[PDB]
């Protein structure tokens, strides 16, 4: 049930060449990879390169391992194979920012666990896949899609010559796993409000600690929904764009309710996008300047993320208004 790459497409990854005007631009936060969009799997094979190493991965595998990925991913709206690659490009800002701060398990882990971290997304959120009683969701009674992503990495790595971990102890194998997996289910938004307030909790005290690995986890779960919400950090007209997105795909999932006669939440419903800047305004409030207003302090140099979130704010704030 996976879909396997051909030869041409890992092929001709291999040879890609980065451009030397975006080996410059890559390493900002605040970078769209929008518009070089035949040139994003070699983006991530930089991205590895220059966080891990050359010889970290052998670059034929890595190289299948990328393009079944883009491959497993669907063609809806907004978590599609762009966004994987927004969240990882994140991630590696983020890593290249605090580099010895993490292991070198741990920078393989997480930039591989944020390329697959919405592997096979239906379109559909969990709450919809739950309430209307889906295969899926009977198989995962809390996080049910998180699930499914983390299952859908790891049939991946099975496939012939796709396995990246091959060369590691086994040791280190169900290591990577369990960080890949924890990473991966941190990115349903349910589990950031409890793991936010418990890191400012663990915050303020003082009992915060990086090498108490119950911490280490909830620090690189909150990293997991700043990379996972980035396109709130990026440039105004970007940020507008991708919100776009966001909202095609809701509005398309409350199409769905409608017709079996229940009325969606606000957000999905299409007839309110008058509500959307307050809903947004909401949303910045509530969970954006949070995640990152955390992120910031147990990590300084994440600030350009909270800071061009602030100026997102801002403009959303304008759009109610009446000046856009
Ligand atoms: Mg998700
Ligand atoms: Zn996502």
New binding site residues.
């Given amino acids: 049930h996976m879909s396997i790459c051909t030869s041409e497409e890992w092929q001709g990854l291999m040879q890609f060449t980065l451009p030397v005007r975006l080996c410059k631009e890559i390493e900002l936060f605040h970078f769209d990879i929008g518009p070089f969009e035949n040139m994003w799997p070699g983006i991530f094979v930089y991205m590895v390169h220059r966080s891990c190493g050359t010889s970290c991965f052998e670059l034929e595998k890595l190289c299948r391992f990328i393009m079944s990925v883009k491959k497993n991913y669907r063609r809806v709206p907004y978590?599609n194979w762009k966004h994987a690659v927004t969240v990882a490009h994140c991630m590696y800002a983020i890593l290249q920012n605090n580099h010895t701060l993490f292991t070198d398990l741990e920078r393989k882990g997480l930039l591989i666990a944020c390329l697959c971290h919405?592997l096979d997304?239906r379109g559909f959120s969990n709450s919809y896949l739950q309430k209307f009683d889906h295969p899926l969701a009977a198989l995962y009674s809390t996080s049910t899609?998180?699930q499914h992503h983390f299952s859908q990495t790891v049939s991946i790595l099975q496939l012939e010559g796709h396995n990246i971990f091959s060369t590691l102890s086994s040791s280190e194998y169900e290591q990577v796993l369990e960080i890949i997996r924890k990473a991966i289910i941190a990115?349903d938004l349910a589990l950031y409000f409890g793991n936010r307030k418990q890191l400012e909790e663990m915050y303020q005290t003082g009992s915060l600690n990086l090498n108490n690995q119950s911490h280490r986890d909830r620090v690189i779960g909150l990293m997991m929904t700043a990379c996972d919400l980035c396109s709130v950090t990026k440039l105004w007209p970007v940020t507008k764009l991708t919100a776009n997105d966001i909202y095609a795909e809701f509005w398309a999932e409350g199409d769905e309710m409608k017709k079996l006669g229940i009325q969606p939440i606000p957000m999905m419903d299409r007839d309110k996008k008058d509500e959307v800047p307050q809903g947004q305004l909401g949303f910045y409030n509530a969970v954006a300047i949070p995640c990152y207003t955390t992120l910031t302090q147990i990590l300084p140099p994440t600030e350009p993320l909270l800071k061009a979130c602030r100026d997102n704010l801002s403009q959303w704030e304008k759009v109610i208004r009446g000046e856009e």
């Fill in positions: 978590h919405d997304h899609m998180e990115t």
